[PDB]
Amino acid sequence: EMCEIPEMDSHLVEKLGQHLLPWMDRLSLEHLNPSIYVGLRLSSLQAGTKEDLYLHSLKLGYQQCLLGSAFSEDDGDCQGKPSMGQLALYLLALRANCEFVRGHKGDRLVSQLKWFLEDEKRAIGHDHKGHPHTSYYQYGLGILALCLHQKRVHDSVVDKLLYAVEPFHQGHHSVDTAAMAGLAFTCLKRSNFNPGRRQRITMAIRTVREEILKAQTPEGHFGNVYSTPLALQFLMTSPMPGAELGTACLKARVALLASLQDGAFQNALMISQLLPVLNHKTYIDLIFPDCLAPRVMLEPAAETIPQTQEIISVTLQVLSLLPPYRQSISVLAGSTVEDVLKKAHELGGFTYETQASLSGPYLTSVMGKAAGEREFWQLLRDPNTPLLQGIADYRPKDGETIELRLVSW
Numbered sequence: 566e567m568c569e570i571p572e573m574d575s576h577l578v579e580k581l582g583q584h585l586l587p588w589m590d591r592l593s594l595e596h597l598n599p600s601i602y603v604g605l606r607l608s609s610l611q612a613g614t615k616e617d618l619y620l621h622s623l624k625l626g627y628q629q630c631l632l633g634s635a636f637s638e639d640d641g642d643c644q645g646k647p648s649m650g651q652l653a654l655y656l657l658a659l660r661a662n663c664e665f666v667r668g669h670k671g672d673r674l675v676s677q678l679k680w681f682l683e684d685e686k687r688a689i690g691h692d693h694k695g696h697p698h699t700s701y702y703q704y705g706l707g708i709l710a711l712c713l714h715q716k717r718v719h720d721s722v723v724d725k726l727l728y729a730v731e732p733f734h735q736g737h738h739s740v741d742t743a744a745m746a747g748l749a750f751t752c753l754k755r756s757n758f759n760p761g762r763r764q765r766i767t768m769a770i771r772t773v774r775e776e777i778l779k780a781q782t783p784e785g786h787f788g789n790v791y792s793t794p795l796a797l798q799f800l801m802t803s804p805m806p807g808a809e810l811g812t813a814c815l816k817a818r819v820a821l822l823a824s825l826q827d828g829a830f831q832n833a834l835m836i837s838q839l840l841p842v843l844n845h846k847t848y849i850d851l852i853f854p855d856c857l858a859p860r861v862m863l864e865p866a867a868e869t870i871p872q873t874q875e876i877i878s879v880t881l882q883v884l885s886l887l888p889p890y891r892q893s894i895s896v897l898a899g900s901t902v903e904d905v906l907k908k909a910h911e912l913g914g915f916t917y918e919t920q921a922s923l924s925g926p927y928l929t930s931v932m933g934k935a936a937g938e939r940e941f942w943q944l945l946r947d948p949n950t951p952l953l954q955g956i957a958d959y960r961p962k963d964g965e966t967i968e969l970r971l972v973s974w
């Protein structure tokens with residue numbers, strides 16, 4: 566149809582699936598990723614028996630931790646617990662296996678996620694002035710999740726998502742939050758969930774595609790390379806032709822195909838967001854999913870690029886702190902930013918804290934300064950160009966400088 570990408574080189578898709586393959590074995594609570602599972606099921610690729618065991622661990626961990634305690638066993642956080650944002654994605658994972666939340670534990674989880682959105686609605690406080698504690702992205706994903714499990718939220722919850730769509734938004738992220746918000750609305754619209762806002766919701770969806778389609782860079786991308794998959798995902802639901810989508814969507818293909826054969830898609834989460842798209846599938850396909858639709862097996866990557874020894878110098882610097890820190894760390898070539906961070910800690914006076922996430926290690930504290938409220942520890946490559954990847958996916962080159970900067974958004 567109108568916003569459609571033709572199929573790609575069968576082995577390029579297979580290449581991406583092979584990146585996911587080593588994750589199907591890290592069933593650790595701090596490595597289980599519902600987005601990966603959803604990724605596979607909606608792709609043209611299929612792991613194998615590993616899948617079912619992965620889903621089982623998801624069901625185990627996510628329920629064992631989010632439900633199962635009365636007066637608490639006198640501990641701080643004895644699992645860490647999945648975030649409510651993470652719970653939302655787990656719900657899509659269930660859908661990926663053609664399942665609805667079953668039993669009391671189902672009722673409990675649904676109830677929990679409805680509460681999260683309710684707190685995030687208080688956090689905003691009416692239709693002006695105030696941010697969610699998480700982000701409008703998880704807010705949109707919360708609404709979408711429950712909508713896929715045939716659970717409705719009150720109009721006052723949808724209201725806040727409706728409002729964020731109009732203005733707001735600066736810097737690449739906008740395009741993802743728009744796409745997510747956009748998808749949520751599609752869902753609601755396709756089942757008439759908030760009738761009192763039916764006409765209102767349709768307008769918003771129309772608002773979203775303008776915002777997104779407007780943000781198409783001359784390369785062909787939507788916002789950036791990593792905002793493109795989720796953008797396309799949303800745009801593959803909009804049924805209004807003319808011409809607009811046709812060429813713009815087909816342009817994105819070129820921009821994507823280029824980046825793809827460049828190795829831009831290293832991150833497991835990002836592969837799992839593109840794979841459905843690559844298979845003409847969206848998260849909206851999780852309303853009526855096809856569990857019998859066949860997918861080709863994935864052989865183990867088996868061979869692993871051995872690379873080559875070449876010791877390189879990378880300058881790590883932290884301004885935005887007490888005495889500014891800067892030290893030329895020496896690592897093996899192909900090392901990740903996290904390796905540079907790691908060597909610095911053991912080398913001298915440097916520390917850092919991370920958190921796990923569906924996206925990988927998230928940098929939270931540097932040199933003993935934990936990021937506050939609407940601030941975060943930005944990653945940058947000198948001069949002043951923010952990184953498109955995290956500490957665990959960016960592999961700096963010789964003589965490069967990395968800045969860890971505490972900005973506020």
Ligand code: B12
Pocket residue numbers: 648650651652654698699700702703706737738741742789790791792793795832835922923924925926927928929940941942943944945951952953954955956958974
């Ligand atoms: C929310 C968000 C943020 C927020 C998070 C704070 C908040 N609001 O609570 C802010 C604005 C701070 C942010 C910053 C960054 N982000 Co961000 N972010 C997102 C967004 C919109 C949604 C993620 C989300 O909420 N997921 C839902 C829940 C279920 O997932 P989760 O794993 O539990 O969510 C946590 C992590 O995703 C983490 N997080 C957010 N961004 C990133 C990026 C990386 C690399 C990692 C490891 C973690 C991480 O924030 C969430 C917890 O609050 C996505 C869009 C997308 N398409 O995924 C981009 C996205 C994940 N971010 C991205 C990037 C590049 C970054 C930064 C590295 C930017 C930078 N140059 O410094 C930083 C991370 C800083 C760090 N210390 O590592 C990319 C990752 C691309 C890739 N190939 O890995 C994405 C896809 C956006 C994009 N299109 O470029 N981000």
